[PDB]
Each structure stands twice: as C-alpha cells, then as structure tokens.
C-alpha cells in the first residue's frame, strides 16, 4: 500500500542517515587522533 511504501522509505532514510553519521564520525576520529 502507499502507507507501507512510505514507511519503507522512512526506514531507508533513517538507515542512510546513520551511515552518514558514522562516516563523519570516522573522519572526526582521525582528525582528533592525528
């Protein structure tokens, strides 16, 4: 249904946002450590 497609899209947005956050965190770690 349209409601279930929107929930699927929301979950995908959340997954991608966490991966963005984790990537930025990896780079911030490197800068702090260096």
């Amino acid at each position: 249904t349209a409601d279930a497609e929107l929930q699927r899209l929301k979950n995908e947005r959340h997954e991608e946002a966490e991966l963005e956050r984790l990537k930025s965190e990896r780079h911030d770690h490197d800068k702090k450590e260096a």
């Binding site: 929107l6 929301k10 947005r13 963005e20």
Partner: protein, 83 residues
Amino acid sequence: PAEECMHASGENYDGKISKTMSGLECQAWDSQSPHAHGYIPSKFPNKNLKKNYCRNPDRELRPWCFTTDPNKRWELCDIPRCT
C-alpha cells in the same frame, strides 16, 4: 495562506518553509538531483509534496526535506508548534 506551524508532528503541514533546521535549501520533490529518492509527488497526492517545501508524508518526527547539499541527503525542518 496555510498556517506555518504544526499542531502535532506536521502530518497536515502545508506551508512554504523550504529550508532545513541547519539552513540548507530543500531539494524539490519533483527533482532526483542531487538525491535520488522515491517520494514521487504524483505517487503520493494526499501528501502535498509541492515545490521544495518541508513536508511530513511518512510519520517522521516533524516535516523534513531532501537537501541540495550532496553530503546531506535529508534533514528535519524547524516548524514551530502551534499555540
């Protein structure tokens, strides 16, 4: 004009705020650039995915949009709560 606030989490928000909480310009819903996405305006007509306006089509915490920043796929918008 539509009220520029939300009574709950923005399910009925239909205003014209088009910047995210961090100040990024929203990507237009009818554009797939810089971010490809599945929130196709003609596929979800009751969600009012108009121009590049912040919307909450999917029971997000508040209205949001894809951003024109290639390094930021999407972000929540700063929609005040109605009083």
